[PDB]
């Protein structure tokens, strides 16, 4: 545990020996920055510190500059001083820094540098007699004439330290090549209640104002690290599309109980530039790309368990703290091996419960997961399967005890108007009365009336896609006032529909409008394997799909995602508390890069 | 297990199937009827087993307060999956109650109804 | 006028919106509810002015067989036109009444209902 003394001077070279005795506990490391002023004599300080070999003294001279005279001299000095402060920083503890020496310019610059990068105790040396001879300061110390004053502890910013590795430690350079990232900061600090009181996670008000404005900066493609470290929530994810090709497909195939029952000859056709498609594709090919998985391969119980474990591991790897999965228990049932849909759902429930319990027992980061029983449309398809799915979901919820639970149902598939939501409005009475939750996917290419029926007949609390809501102002009004969440997958819709900067396209992503209007939008992934993009990539691609979006709209999106999840109240409070603490730490440590 | 044990020894055995009774409450937690119906549907979905679920029972207080003109739209669900329904409208009931228990609930079997003589 | 005058003085003012209350008259003419609601859909269309109509109040049922689903034929309009409603299912009402009110009227708010504990 060693403190580093940082000081600078322009005419009073003798402040450093006085500052050395700030605290009687003893000072270890001292370092001084000074320009090329020929007046300065380092010999006096050298012989003063030769009395204490245990203290290591470094003399750093601003090469090519002696005194600030104009703009270029000032900025050159400022850049080299900042580089020296970054270099001499202890990697663990904040330092002790004084600024008595030097004229107002260096003192102010050092103070601003300390306020930026932190200091254990910044202070000022008050010398009444301004001693010049070696003995005089010792006489003052014995008398007590020398006084030391400090304005208080100054934490500075937590994690901006890896800039010393972003900029390599180089001493041979000039002002021709400097980094204007601090001036970029200065510009960003107050460049721009659109974002003032929209702050979610009230713990977000603790970071230094530099952060409180940094979050308002527009999002960029280089934000991958922060997005990955950011805890996220996925609410629309299809399990039947997690593993589709490559290592995941090989692993799930190899864990099958009966290898002979599976085929290893069919593979999905590659799309040039996937996932960033250069040409919009129809829905049929999108489902066909997932033909390698689904029901033709997931019938095997071992395949089921392997797929569930792999999906959970991938979700935990993506820093996701909560998610809801969509699964079709009937689509994987098989009466020949006595594999009913209920058995499949029970297996999935026990697998998720065991995984999360094992993760929690070791006090690691675990992704809480809840189920969604998708009520597949099955245009004719023995339509009693709808009632079968509703009954299965009702009894699965009625099972009750457990930490992993089924929370709602979803209806989707065959989105065309022939299978709209204005048919089964009479069946959903029981599932709603018992206490379940309802989700209705409709709006990708449907009329602006089906959404009204879905929200006001089935009382759906979530709306799949609904990309064309912008042309129905009254639908916007009712959705906003009724607080109905909208789950919507960026990359999947980009691949299917197409938005700027898609070539030969003019349609723009209606996301930014959906946020500023006030719609409870929640970004999701739909089919991870088919789309080939996790939640982190989906968030990152927003900078290209919706230009001008800021790094704080993603926090508001995540807050909306927490709000719109069909979860109990107390679990919501716990999730918000853990999540806001985690976000606070993440943004404290993030911009370091 | 019991019927399998009885049959394996080649002795007379009694095949038996279960009926899920939709107990009448009509006072609180009225979702219990829907819960019972969903449980019965999922139970019959088991498929395997010589002993299975074949029908549901609309028993309880058969008075006018719980006649057959209440939950027919919900019974559409159980009837969709090809499940039999047994009603019970035999004590302190008027002919029209039996009538739309027959024609709205579509009870493939009927319980009691001792006073059927007076309704030709 | 009052709000504008207070705001011009730049002192502390109170924003105020009105909610037209449906008649508390089950007896007498029943066209009163229709004319009240039709007045509301017209009143919302003024647009200009700090003050506004933003919703209706559905008080008027006497906790008897009226419940809140009786008047349901008339309320397909205000929700289609973007208004809001407010139930008053307090007094002495069973959980079923509040349930049907909130799931047919789709009331964004709810009045009283102190005995909500007994219906988890
Ligand atoms: Mg989907």
UniProtKB/TrEMBL annotation, chain A:
Presence of the UniProt keyword Metal-binding in the record: yes
Keyword line: ATP-binding, Metal-binding, Nucleotide-binding
Residue positions binding ATP 9: 295, 331-332, 376, 413
Binding-site positions, ATP 7: 291, 331-332
Binding site for ATP 6: 290, 295, 331
Residues binding ATP 10, per UniProt: 366, 574, 578, 581
Ligand binding (ATP 8): 295, 331-332
UniProt binding sites for Mg(2+): 236, 238, 441, 526
Binding residue positions for ATP 5: 240-241, 295, 328, 331-332, 376
Protein's name according to its UniProt entry: Uncharacterized protein
Residues bound to ATP 1: 162, 366, 581
Binding site for ATP 2: 165, 366, 578, 581
Protein residues bound to ATP 3: 165, 578, 581-582
Ligand binding (ATP 4): 238, 291, 295, 376
Keyword Flavoprotein attributed: no
From TrEMBL, chains B, C:
Keyword S-adenosyl-L-methionine: no
Signal peptide: none
Binding sites annotated in the UniProt record for ATP 4: 23
Key word ATP-binding present: yes
Record: residues binding ATP 9: 23, 60
Residues given in the record as ATP 1 binding sites: 13
Chain positions recorded as Mg(2+) binding sites: 88
Sites where the protein binds ATP 5: 23
Keywords linked to the UniProt accession: ATP-binding, Metal-binding, Nucleotide-binding
UniProt binding sites for ATP 10: 13
Binding site for ATP 2: 13
Name under which the protein is recorded: Uncharacterized protein
Protein species of origin: Bacteroidales bacterium
